[PDB]
Design a protein around this motif. Structure first.
Motif, mmCIF file in Angstrom:
data_model
loop_
_atom_site.group_PDB
_atom_site.id
_atom_site.type_symbol
_atom_site.label_atom_id
_atom_site.label_comp_id
_atom_site.label_asym_id
_atom_site.label_seq_id
_atom_site.Cartn_x
_atom_site.Cartn_y
_atom_site.Cartn_z
ATOM 1 N N UNK A 134 6.894 1.111 2.622
ATOM 2 C CA UNK A 134 6.319 1.711 1.435
ATOM 3 C C UNK A 134 4.833 1.390 1.379
ATOM 4 N N UNK A 135 4.541 0.101 1.482
ATOM 5 C CA UNK A 135 3.314 -0.476 0.960
ATOM 6 C C UNK A 135 3.170 -0.265 -0.559
ATOM 7 N N UNK B 61 5.399 -0.697 -2.835
ATOM 8 C CA UNK B 61 6.016 -1.837 -3.521
ATOM 9 C C UNK B 61 5.136 -3.082 -3.460
ATOM 10 N N UNK B 62 4.434 -3.288 -2.341
ATOM 11 C CA UNK B 62 3.501 -4.402 -2.233
ATOM 12 C C UNK B 62 2.342 -4.177 -3.179
ATOM 13 N N UNK B 63 1.907 -2.932 -3.281
ATOM 14 C CA UNK B 63 0.793 -2.600 -4.145
ATOM 15 C C UNK B 63 1.231 -2.806 -5.605
ATOM 16 N N UNK C 245 1.066 -6.511 -6.608
ATOM 17 C CA UNK C 245 -0.315 -6.889 -6.898
ATOM 18 C C UNK C 245 -0.752 -6.392 -8.278
ATOM 19 N N UNK D 252 7.087 -15.167 -10.086
ATOM 20 C CA UNK D 252 5.687 -15.031 -9.705
ATOM 21 C C UNK D 252 4.884 -14.460 -10.847
ATOM 22 N N UNK E 235 -1.501 -12.787 -2.265
ATOM 23 C CA UNK E 235 -1.242 -11.345 -2.392
ATOM 24 C C UNK E 235 -2.088 -10.513 -1.436
ATOM 25 N N UNK F 239 -1.108 -8.373 2.008
ATOM 26 C CA UNK F 239 -1.375 -6.956 2.167
ATOM 27 C C UNK F 239 -2.110 -6.665 3.479
ATOM 28 N N UNK G 141 6.627 -6.199 7.673
ATOM 29 C CA UNK G 141 7.073 -5.342 6.559
ATOM 30 C C UNK G 141 7.442 -3.943 7.060
ATOM 31 N N UNK H 142 11.060 -2.124 6.657
ATOM 32 C CA UNK H 142 11.259 -0.877 5.928
ATOM 33 C C UNK H 142 12.378 -0.089 6.593
#
Lengths: 276, 279
Positions: free
Chosen positions: A45-46, A48-50, A53, A135, B48, B52, B137, B141
């Motif tokens: 996805x990225x 979900x990471x975004x 944040x 978190x 974080x 990323x 990651x 996925x």
């Protein structure tokens, strides 16, 4: 719900604005929830990471504004506020938030494009919140309670009742003291001051309006509690009735005295404001 | 100076740019290091933004390997993860351009005091498994929980001095280039141009093939000379089976022949003599 930026930059004083039972009439909404900082969540996805944040930044900004609201004091009132706001973030993420006004709708949309809308999407959301809540709490507590005590998931209506209760017991002494200062005792040998003294009459009318709001707010919230509990069978060991929440949240809560107060039949209100 | 965004969007092909021994003369720097994605770190919670950058780096290394889950992918993840570590710990040997902005950002976070360095190493050691997970990651996925079997976490989170890792990476580049450069040479220079004379004696295309080979192997010799001597001086200024820099090649490469390797980079191996030495 009606702004996105200004409310990540300043809060109202607590109790400056009362619970709102008029906007969505099956629930009452606290000013704090209306002002919850979700600027990054809104501007989202990225993926979900975004998301993580963006949620960490909003949460840190919320937690810092609540510190400044508590005059930078690190105490129970601050910790409770952290817990209430943390809890609301949780429901916003999980899709079980009762506000759903304005920019909260945009955030719900953003989450739907990230997680999906299928039956098991809400399941994914709930799981993601479990894995992230520690978190988020940390982030709110960064600028500075009991972590695990907060992280315990409770339905939103339970938590809003706790918040409501703390507001009520904080407001009650002030309102009674105001009454007392205008209305105590008699104007002659027989007649209470409320019988003839305009400032006392004004004071009693002002009290009447305040306690009438309290009664309507308790009625809406407590009935929401019962319907939420019936509809999803919220089996909670300590808690059977909505009054159980108040008993557990509030020092020296007397539920008979509480019903007397919000129904204007307590000794103090009668003595001060009832002529006959 | 280098780049910040470009290298978080795409990687050059492997070996499109050789190791760089000219920018800092006591070390050679691999193109993968130069391109290490650090956009968030540069613009710099820290965990974080590192997560990323690592996630972007990992996905890009997967693309570089044409989405092949094999040893070459896992080694790259390992090398870039290690470089993130030396960046976090303040022990990175590149320290060019935006890397200095990142080092400055880390100093403003951890401090510069006597044991700021010790806290950065603690932070890294507590976080490294998490950063490796982030690099994976992209795989996670697709494979979900089974992402953990694609590459070995335990191998990746072992701390080696950077010079050790770069020698392993260098060695893998060398043995991938050598068969190709030798084939090129062979195709122009093999055998004789008449009954007695080797082609290199009189055939200009072969003579130029030898020069071109000479250029390549001279780069290899200079890179191995710089890296192996750096290993030694790093070692002296401070650890498991590794005594000499040749030991590292022996651990990394299949049936590594040290004598043959020294013959090759010094242009006295049988193939080079046969193809490029007239008399």
């Amino acid at each position: 719900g009606n702004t996105v930026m200004k409310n990540c930059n300043y809060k109202r004083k607590r109790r400056e604005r009362d619970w709102d039972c008029n906007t969505k009439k099956d629930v009452c909404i606290p000013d704090r929830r209306y002002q919850l900082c979700m600027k990054e969540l809104t501007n989202l996805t990225f993926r979900k990471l975004y998301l993580k944040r963006k949620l960490i930044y909003d949460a840190a900004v919320e937690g810092d504004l609540l510190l400044k609201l508590n005059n930078y004091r690190y105490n129970k009132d601050f910790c409770k506020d952290i817990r209430w706001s943390l809890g609301d973030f949780g429901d916003i993420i999980m899709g079980t938030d009762m506000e759903g006004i304005g920019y909260s709708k945009v955030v719900e949309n953003n989450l739907r494009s990230i997680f999906g809308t299928d039956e098991k999407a809400q399941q994914r959301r709930k799981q993601w919140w479990n894995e992230s809540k520690a978190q988020i709490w940390t982030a709110m507590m960064y600028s500075v309670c009991k972590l695990n005590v907060a992280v315990n998931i409770e339905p939103q209506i339970y938590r809003w009742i706790r918040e409501w209760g703390r507001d009520y017991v904080s407001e009650l002494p002030t309102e009674v003291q105001k009454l007392k200062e205008k209305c105590d005792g008699k104007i002659n040998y027989t007649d209470k001051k409320v019988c003839k003294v305009p400032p006392c009459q004004n004071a009693c009318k002002s009290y009447d309006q305040w306690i009438t709001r309290k009664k309507n707010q308790w009625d809406v919230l407590s009935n929401k509690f019962i319907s939420v509990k019936n509809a999803e069978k919220v089996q909670t060991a300590g808690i059977v009735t909505p009054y159980d929440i108040l008993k557990q949240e509030l020092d020296e809560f007397n539920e008979v005295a509480f019903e007397n107060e919000i129904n204007k039949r307590d000794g103090a209100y009668i003595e001060l404001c009832v002529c006959s």
